[PDB]
C-alpha cells in the first residue's frame, strides 16, 4: 500500500563545493609511477553540488532527479536511512526500471516493469525486524535481470558514481571517515569500481530510496536525512598514479590556464 509522504511544498536547493572529489579509476588497467591523460565523464573540479535535505527536522521532500550523462552521489550518515536508488525513464509499468536496494545482509538489484509509488520508500517494522518493498512499488512483472551480492553501503562518508554506457550500468564507490559537517571534505580520493551490470536499459531519471519506520503516512517516521548530487561531464583529466597504482592526485584540464599547462606538459 502506497501512502502520501510528500504533503509539503518543495524546499529550495542548497549548494556545496565539490573541490577535487568525484574522481574514479577510468578503467581496469594497472599503471604505476606515471601521469596518464584520460578523456571520460568526470565531476568538474570546484563545481556546485546540490545539497538535498530529503528529511528535514517532519518535512519529507525527496524529489525525482535527472540522470543526464551520469551522477555523482554522496551522503554522510550513521542512521542507515538511505538504502538504495531507482533508475529509469517513465518510472512506471510501461518501461523497464532498475531497482537497487541494500539491507542488513545483502544488496538486491532487479530490473523489471515496476509500478512505483508516487513517493516510494522502504518499510521497516519492529516486532525481530521485518522489511517490505511493497512500499516502493505496488507490483512488478517481466523481469529481465537479477543480481544479489554483499551490501554496497566521526561519521562515515559514502560516495558513488553511476554511469550507463552501451547497456552497462557501472557503479564506482568509496568509503572514508569524515569529521566535518554540512559540507564535503578537501583532499583527493579515487573511487574504485564496484560492479558492471549488463542490463541494457535507458536511464534518464532517478530517485533515492529512504527507509522509514512504522512508529496512514503519518505513521511513518525517520530521522533527518541528506545527500549530495552532482553531474558528470566530458572532461580531460591528468591522473597521477603512485608506485602501487593508486591515484594520488589529478588535474582538471579545463579548470584554469595553469591546469591546461600541466595537462599539456604532463607534469604536476
Amino acid at each position: 500500500q502506497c501512502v502520501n509522504l510528500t504533503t509539503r511544498t518543495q524546499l529550495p536547493p542548497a549548494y556545496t563545493n565539490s573541490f577535487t572529489r568525484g574522481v574514479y579509476y577510468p578503467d581496469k588497467v594497472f599503471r604505476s609511477s606515471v601521469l596518464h591523460s584520460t578523456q571520460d565523464l568526470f565531476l568538474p573540479f570546484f563545481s556546485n553540488v546540490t545539497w538535498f535535505h530529503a528529511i528535514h527536522v517532519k518535512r519529507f521532500d525527496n524529489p525525482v532527479l535527472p540522470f543526464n550523462d551520469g551522477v555523482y552521489f554522496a551522503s554522510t550518515e550513521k542512521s542507515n536511512i538511505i538504502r538504495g536508488w531507482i533508475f529509469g525513464t517513465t518510472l512506471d509499468s510501461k518501461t523497464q526500471s532498475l531497482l537497487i536496494v541494500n539491507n542488513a545482509t545483502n544488496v538486491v538489484i532487479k530490473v523489471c516493469e515496476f509500478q512505483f509509488c508516487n513517493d516510494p520508500f522502504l518499510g521497516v517494522y519492529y516486532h525481530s525486524w521485518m522489511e517490505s518493498e511493497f512500499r516502493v512499488y505496488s507490483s512488478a512483472n517481466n523481469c529481465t535481470f537479477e543480481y544479489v551480492s554483499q551490501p554496497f553501503l566521526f561519521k562515515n562518508l559514502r560516495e558513488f558514481v553511476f554511469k550507463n554506457i552501451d547497456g552497462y550500468f557501472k557503479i564506482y564507490s568509496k568509503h572514508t571517515p569524515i569529521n566535518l559537517v554540512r559540507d564535503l571534505p578537501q583532499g583527493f580520493s579515487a573511487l574504485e569500481p564496484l560492479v558492471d551490470l549488463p542490463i541494457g536499459i535507458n536511464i534518464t531519471r532517478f530517485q533515492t530510496l529512504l527507509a522509514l519506520h512504522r512508529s496512514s503516512s503519518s505513521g511513518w517516521t525517520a530521522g533527518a536525512a541528506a545527500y549530495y548530487v552532482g553531474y558528470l561531464q566530458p572532461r580531460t583529466f591528468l591522473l597521477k598514479y603512485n608506485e602501487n597504482g593508486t591515484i594520488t592526485d589529478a588535474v582538471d584540464c579545463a579548470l584554469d590556464p595553469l591546469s591546461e599547462t600541466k595537462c599539456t606538459l604532463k607534469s604536476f
Partner: antibody
Framework: EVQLVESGGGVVQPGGSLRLSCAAS????????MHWVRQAPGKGLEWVAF????????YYADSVKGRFTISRDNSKNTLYLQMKSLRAEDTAVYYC???????????????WGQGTLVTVS | VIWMTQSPSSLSASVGDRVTITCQAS??????LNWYQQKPGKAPKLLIS???NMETGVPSRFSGSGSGTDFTFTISSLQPEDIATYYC?????????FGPGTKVDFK
C-alpha cells in the same frame, strides 16, 4: 519557490536582431535542459529550441534553424536566445520552459516563465 | 519531423458533460505524449505526461490514454473552470512538436 523570468523583448525592424534572456531561480538550473517556446497572437504553441544541461548539444526547429542560436550561462543561471535575420512571421510571445520529458532532458517537473513579447515590423 | 493534429479544433459543452479530445501523430510515438491546458494570458499548464500519467494536483476528473499514433484526452465531468485551449505535445524525438490546439468553449 521556482521562477523563470523572460526579458529583452521589444520592437525591432525586419532583417534585424534581438537577444532574449531568462533568469532562473528556485531550482538547480544547471542540472536541467531548457526549451524555448513561442506563441504568435491567435495561434497555438510552437517549439523553438532546446539546449542540454551542460550547454553542449543544441537543437532547433526547422523554421528557425540557421537563424536562431541557443545558449546558457550556468554560473548566472541564465538562458539566452539570440535571434538573427528576424521576419514579420517571428512576432510572438517567447517563453523559457522546463518541459517534463522522460526521454531527453529527464525533467520530472514542468516549469514555465511569464513570456516576453517580440514584435517584428 | 513528426506531425501532430487534433480533432475537433473546437467544441462546446455544458457543465457535467463529458469532453473528449483526439490527438493523432503522423508517426508512432509510443507513449511519449504530454497534454497541456492554456488559459488566455497565462503559460500552459501540464496535466498529463507519458500519455496517461496524471500530474500531482490535477483533479481526478481528468484522464487520458492511447498508444502509437492515436491518443485521447478526456474530461469526465466538465467544470466551468475547465474552459481552456488544450494542446498535445510529442517528445519521442527532436524537434518536439505541439498540436494545433483544441478550444473547449462553454455551451
Amino acid at each position: 519557490e521556482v521562477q523563470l523570468v523572460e526579458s529583452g523583448g521589444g520592437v525591432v525592424q525586419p532583417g534585424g536582431s534581438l537577444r532574449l534572456s531568462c533568469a532562473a531561480s528556485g531550482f538547480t538550473f544547471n542540472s536541467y535542459g531548457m526549451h524555448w517556446v513561442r506563441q504568435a497572437p491567435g495561434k497555438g504553441l510552437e517549439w523553438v529550441a532546446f539546449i542540454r544541461y551542460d550547454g553542449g548539444n543544441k537543437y532547433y526547429a526547422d523554421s528557425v534553424k540557421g537563424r536562431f542560436t541557443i545558449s546558457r550561462d550556468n554560473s548566472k543561471n541564465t538562458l539566452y536566445l539570440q535571434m538573427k535575420s528576424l521576419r514579420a512571421e517571428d512576432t510572438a510571445v517567447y517563453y523559457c520552459a522546463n518541459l517534463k520529458d522522460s526521454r531527453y532532458s529527464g525533467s520530472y517537473y514542468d516549469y514555465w516563465g511569464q513570456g516576453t513579447l517580440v514584435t517584428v515590423s | 519531423v513528426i506531425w501532430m493534429t487534433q480533432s475537433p479544433s473546437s467544441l462546446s459543452a455544458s457543465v457535467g458533460d463529458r469532453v473528449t479530445i483526439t490527438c493523432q501523430a503522423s508517426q508512432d510515438i509510443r507513449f511519449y505524449l504530454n497534454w497541456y491546458q492554456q488559459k488566455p494570458g497565462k503559460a500552459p499548464k501540464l496535466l498529463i505526461s507519458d500519455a496517461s500519467n496524471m500530474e500531482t494536483g490535477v483533479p481526478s476528473r481528468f484522464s487520458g490514454s492511447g498508444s502509437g499514433t492515436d491518443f485521447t484526452f478526456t474530461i469526465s465531468s466538465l467544470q466551468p473552470e475547465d474552459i481552456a485551449t488544450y494542446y498535445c505535445q510529442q517528445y519521442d524525438n527532436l524537434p518536439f512538436t505541439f498540436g494545433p490546439g483544441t478550444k473547449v468553449d462553454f455551451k
